[PDB]
């Protein structure tokens, strides 16, 4: 009961982190009270009751019904601590008054008042920090519960709504409340405490001064109204900035998720300039908001002297004054100014932010839902949404395969979604058993082992798993990795090839036992032989007992299919059978800008001039009462004489934002120029979290926190120096305090930094799991694995929250053991109970009263400095047509498996050198090694210029790339086709022609103006391939490395690729990696990547 009160349970973790490293096991396990599952259960029950019983559902009521009693129980103790703070200066002024021979009504009562002031100090100690920690815990619990509720709603979110809300919206939504909602609950409870403290202090100052407390309160109220107006005007500057932040975040997320494609296209300058275009707009509002918040937070320091002036003039002008009763006024007014200028506007701002976040989150939870209501799949007169489908109708019995064929953009995938239940048929009905197994057209590989990616959250079945992995031809690929079957794949499956990803997705679809199977072209990225073997082993032999609908464009599959449905423009052209058809961090933060140092020098010079002026004025100015109170007045009013005005704080804020600008620009340039192996080393959710938080902190929190720390440090230094020049014993007495302060701060910093880094790197899993949940929500709701993904999210939330709560508990231990212990049990007990010299060491109390605040600001600065440390650690990253290659070894890592081992060949100019090889052989590896994206070796001399005779970008400029991973970023069709805008709309409309996008672009509301959100989800997969083809055509170059251009096209649309090959690339060399026999027939030279070694053939007949 006392261990929790004193937070002595953090002793073991602090002791371990003092001399060791907190890797994974010494982080304490989460308690059961704040477990994410339990918190989500309680909040979900309350929210469901609220929207079932009330008329206008409000999340604030649901949160109140479960947290209000604890909130108020901590708030009353917080108010008691504030009351002990506001009653302290009465005792202080009645104690330090007994320092002169004047013994008026004070005889032998200082010894009876010091022991009371000590008790008040210790009761403030025991009553403030536990309440603050309780409020922090309540905030963390509320954040956990709301995050889990949001994740459940996202799992249940409709498909139509997802067409507009993207990853950036969600990541910006959880970026703020993850580290502000918790810390605001210890500051939003001053809304009724600050008025009460103001009332109490007004009563006391009316007791002291007759009728000047109200006169001072008038100016204080005017300043508080101005502060509230500034806060309201500042909320607007963040509302208009959140959208820009989200857009930049999603743009850079798509950029880094396809950094291979960016490097292949040489889109480093283009995408850098694109991101800075949004960065400038965001930073304009960031700078405006930072100026406004500087003026809002500097109204405390530049108000003390004016408040004292206005509260003394109407009394001292007619009734006299003495230093005792002006110092009591100053002591009361310091607390009054803090309460009404630093505590009430802060509380109002925090309440506004919390209510806005709660309302936005409730709006998110109040979006459209996703409704679903012998497996004889019937479908009659179904129309989908111009209509994507039109009068599509079919009937399938149990154990009867049906094949859906048609042109690109016909609506085969759309029909599959209408079958599953995602798309809403405006007219018609769908009748089938609920169980559905889906193999998406673009395979989705979630982070985790291959076993997890295949089983997908069901009971492990040895025989079924072996049969699936043997039928899908995946055993050969599986028995090559260091882990035989349980090998961990990165997010998005970037370690595997396209064919391996397709095989894994098809295996996952097959493994699940469902009545209906929707194989959305599972043989798109697979070559002819593997596709044939999989079709007659995993679609016609294993699952030859249950109905399955698969999209195909091969006459063999159509002949096998018992029913054929051909779609053209969304209309069922034919529906029958085939037979029927046949008829250093600080040192580098400051020095990264050549103007931050100048601003700091200016501030230091002005501060020194102000200190000299104060010292000479005090020397000129300085009986018995006035012989020692003058320094007390100066050190109680120093917060105004040594405050930064608009001449030394506004430039500091501006430079501290420009530092964030240059840091982000350098970090983005380093990301673009980082080696591909190191980019593979990191993740994508981690990159998104870094660009979301470690730049937002630098933009908003860090400049203002550094301003506050410098303000407090300057005030402390000036108050020390001016008084110590006159009275050196002040600085003599302050040393034994500051040494312990610095000692404890250092003793806790080397563990707080580790905990902060652990929290920062434990934040990435939540974002990287939500990213995959949103990317594969389609298959998630097809498979019904929402409970499994909810359990995964809860595990990730617990993993992050245990670490974060441990860090906050350690920080609270430090901020208690310094503030309310290392002052209250040393200074306020041995500097007041020495009543014998009591003037030259009692002012140490008053100086330390703000030195502890300076130390708090410094420790907050160092806590925030971890973001800059991470940003800098990222910044430190390193950086005719003939071809002749020799001794080329393409390894993805220095110590991995050499994919190619001494491959050598020659390519004549104007020769289409097609490339063959089974899936997983290394064809894409060879194409990437041509651009030396990976490590690579040897020389790729082209007409004379070798690898080392030309810089990397100039080398890559002479290549045309069509990657298997189609890269489309957010932006218009014009931007997608040419970020550099080298060719105008007239010169790109022709490229849209002769490629098949004339009938596709014009369908959208804006011709070359539609914003392709969600990674080009609006287009189909064939249209994505055609867009990449058109982009390659626009990027007029030679020695094109075509990497499966017609990956999912059909022979009707493959003629587009064919005539583009024979027209646009009239005289050049093509290295096309197409798996289509029709496209391979026209090639003049062939390379077969077998046994990890290429060959040199000359004709198809010599090939076979
Ligand atoms: N980034 C990577 N890091 C490590 N290994 C990789 C990486 N990318 C691919 N591999 C592996 O190295 C080998 C090279 O395959 P590659 O990616 O070149 O595909 P591929 O044979 O061209 O594919 P397909 O014909 O199916 O399109 C494969 O075994 C693949 O799983
Ligand atoms: N999310 C979406 N919002 C609006 N229109 C969409 C969306 N997804 C697809 N479409 C459009 O619906 C039509 C049908 O596309 P669909 O993906 O069903 O084609 P498909 O037959 O699967 O094509 P492919 O041969 O490329 O696989 C196209 O005109 C496409 O642009
Ligand atoms: C926490 C707050 C709301 C409690 C109520 C306000 C208090 C602080 C105010 C209201 C009335 C005030 C009192 C009004 C009159 C007197 C008589 C005078 O000879 C001594 C001070 C004294 C006793 C004042 C002290 C402060 C006082 C008690
Ligand atoms: Mg499709
Ligand atoms: Mg490939």
Author numbering: 11 to 383, 389 to 400, 438 to 635, 847 to 885, 908 to 1121, 1129 to 1171, 1207 to 1431
What wording appears in the published article?
In the human body, the chloride channel Cystic Fibrosis Transmembrane conductance Regulator (CFTR) mediates chloride transport across the cell membrane in multiple epithelial-lining organs, including intestines, biliary ducts, pancreas ducts, respiratory airways, and sweat ducts. Topological analysis of CFTR places it in the ATP-binding Cassette (ABC) transporter family, which harnesses the energy from ATP hydrolysis to move substrates across cell membranes. Structurally, ABC proteins possess two transmembrane domains (TMDs) forming the substrate translocation pathway and two cytosolic nucleotide-binding domains (NBDs) that recruit and hydrolyze ATP as the energy source. Once the R domain is phosphorylated, ATP-binding induced NBD dimerization and subsequent hydrolysis of ATP in site 2 are coupled to the opening and closing of the CFTR pore, respectively.
The current study reported two cryo-EM structures of E1371Q-CFTR proteins produced by a lentiviral expression system. The E1371Q-CFTR proteins so produced show highly uniform conformations owing to the E-to-Q mutation abolishing ATP hydrolysis at CFTR’s site 222,68. The yield of the E1371Q-CFTR mutant is high, ensuring that the sample can be effectively concentrated for cryo-grids freezing and that abundant protein particles can be imaged for cryo-EM structure determination. The sharp and symmetric elution peak of E1371Q-CFTR proteins from size exclusion chromatography (SEC) indicates that the sample has high purity and homogeneity, both of which are characteristics ideal for cryo-EM studies. The negative staining images of E1371Q-CFTR, in which individual intact CFTR protein molecules can be readily discerned, show that the proteins are mono-dispersed and not prone to aggregate at room temperature. Upon deposition on cryo-grids, the mono-dispersity of E1371Q-CFTR protein particles is maintained, which facilitates later particle picking and processing. With this high-quality sample, the electron density map of E1371Q-CFTR was determined at an overall resolution of 3.4 Å where densities of the side chains for most amino acids are clearly defined. Our cryo-EM analysis of the E1371Q-CFTR mutant reached an overall resolution of 3.4 Å and revealed a conformation closely resembling the previous structure obtained using the BacMam system, affirming the compatibility of the lentiviral expression system with the BacMam system in producing high-quality CFTR proteins for cryo-EM studies. Thus, the mutations introduced to stabilize the CFTR protein do not disturb the overall structure of the E1371Q-CFTR protein. The fact that the phosphorylated, ATP-bound E1371Q-CFTR conformation is well conserved regardless of the presence of various CFTR potentiators and correctors suggests that this is a stable conformation representing an activated CFTR channel.
